Amino acid sequence: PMVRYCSGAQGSTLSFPPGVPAPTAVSQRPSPSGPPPRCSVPGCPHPRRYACSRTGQALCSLQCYRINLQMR
């Protein structure tokens, strides 16, 4: 149960014994999305500040919230 760390002449080395929790892990890049989300109203080109509650659609401001409320 000994974790060995050797700073040798040829280079560093970190060893892990059998069955050690080997905390050393890896990482990756999650896939990104191309277009950012947009306001659900087709006329409004602003991005999604938030999503509505009563009906559940992307919204930007007071005007588009009122538009979505009226059109439903």
Binding site: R4, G11, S12, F16, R29, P36
Partner: protein, 443 residues
């Protein structure tokens, strides 16, 4: 636009190659002998040989002694320190006068040291603990190094790092999508935050996002920094660290100036001597200008006594405008300029004389033009006559209100009527004193 001060026009002494003083150059007129002496003093300061030499500009009020010090400062440049002071700065409720004076003396001596900065910075993409494929006796593997990919606005590149840095990576929160930076000389790792690119994947995130770095992943530059010798004193007196109850306790308490012991200076001098001998830092002596010296104390003068003959003190320029006055701190020991005779034998006296009406008119014109004011000759002559009647300051001060009155009347320049109206409105010292003397019974 930068606002007009009271000494904005002074840009230099205006001397020839032979040191002779021009009649009017760099915003200064007259005082030819004083300008020549100040040029000699400038050469002395640039000589980098003497130390603790003092000059006293003596003259009546409003004759330009303060202006000549600023002219010397301008002609010196900006790579040499120039510390102004009045005589009332010594009187502190936090520390003794001879330490205010010693700190100021150490302020007027500056350093200039060069160094290189090397950093690997950028967005992290992946962390690959590349292994050597053949663990050693009694172990299941042998990690050789860590491959870290970093990308900036220029490009992406992979760096091979010591495995131990991983132990630091888990100390902070080192996940993909963050921007990091590692100092080449130090070797530590620090996290700045998530990129702006992923700023839209949520609607409310507790962390603030920083923009993606622009430029090469590995930056390396050379920087030269200038620190005065007083900054080293304060830095060494109050160690700014956080891993202590003392450091943090003092950093929570009200900060107070402490009388620096002479042993601290004795070691700072040794280390700066060593680094100068190694050719790393360049020493540049400067100038310390005390105006209104007559406000000092006899204890302050007696400390200045010993302070001047030091081999480290910078060049000091004193200024005063007092006649045969009583020295501050004594009862009736009168002296010229309010300065003790024994100190006054260690200074070189530069005499400053009055101003002739032609030079006064030239000064008024120079001030008007620098200020952005147009004046007619029939009004400029009247203003010069009024100033010669009372003083130069009272003539220069009426420039702006006359311009405002003319602009109110719509005219683009000052005439006789504007000057006479402004003079009728405001008063000078002499007429006010006459009124006070006349009406002494009702004050």
């Amino acid at each position: 636009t930068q606002r007009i001060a009271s000494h904005s026009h002074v840009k230099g002494l205006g001397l020839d190659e032979s040191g002779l003083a021009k009649q009017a150059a760099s915003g200064l007129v007259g005082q030819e002998n004083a300008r020549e002496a100040c040029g000699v003093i400038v050469e002395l300061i640039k000589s980098k040989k003497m130390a603790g030499r003092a000059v006293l500009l003596a003259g009546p009020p409003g004759t330009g002694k303060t202006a000549l010090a600023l002219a010397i400062a301008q002609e010196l440049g900006s790579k040499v320190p120039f510390c102004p002071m009045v005589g009332s700065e010594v009187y502190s409720t936090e520390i003794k006068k001879t330490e205010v004076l010693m700190e100021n003396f150490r302020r007027a001596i500056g350093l200039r040291i060069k160094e290189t900065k090397e950093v690997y910075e950028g967005e992290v993409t992946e962390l690959t603990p590349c292994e050597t494929e053949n663990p050693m006796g009694g172990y299941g593997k042998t990690i050789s190094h860590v491959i870290i990919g970093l990308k900036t606005a220029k490009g992406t590149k992979q760096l091979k790092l010591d495995p131990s840095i991983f132990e630091s990576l888990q100390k902070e929160r080192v996940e993909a999508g963050d921007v990091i930076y590692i100092e080449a000389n130090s070797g530590a790792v620090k996290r700045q935050g998530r990129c702006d690119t992923y700023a839209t994947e949520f609607d409310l995130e507790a962390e603030e996002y920083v923009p993606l770095p622009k430029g090469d992943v590995h930056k390396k530059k050379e920087i030269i920094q200038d620190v005065t010798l007083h900054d080293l004193d304060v830095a060494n007196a109050r160690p700014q660290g956080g891993q202590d109850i003392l450091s943090m306790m003092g950093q929570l308490m009200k900060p107070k100036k402490t009388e620096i012991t002479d042993k601290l200076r004795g070691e700072i001098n040794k280390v700066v001597n060593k680094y100068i001998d190694q050719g790393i830092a360049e020493l540049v002596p400067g100038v310390l200008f005390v105006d209104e010296v007559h406000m000092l104390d006899i204890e302050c003068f007696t400390y200045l006594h010993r302070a001047l003959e030091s081999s480290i003190a910078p060049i000091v320029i004193f200024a005063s405008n007092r006649g045969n006055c009583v020295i501050r701190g004594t009862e009736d020991i009168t002296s010229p300029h309010g300065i003790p005779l024994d100190l006054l034998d260690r200074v070189m006296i530069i005499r400053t004389m009055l101003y002739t009406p032609q030079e006064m008119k030239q000064i008024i014109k120079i001030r008007a033009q620098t200020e952005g004011i147009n004046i007619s000759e029939e009004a400029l002559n009247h203003l010069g006559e009024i100033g010669t009647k009372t003083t130069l300051r009272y003539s220069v001060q009426l420039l702006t209100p006359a311009n405002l009155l003319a602009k109110i009347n719509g005219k683009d320049s000052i005439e006789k009527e504007h000057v006479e109206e402004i003079s009728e409105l405001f008063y000078d010292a002499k007429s006010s004193a006459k009124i006070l003397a006349d009406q002494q019974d009702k004050y």
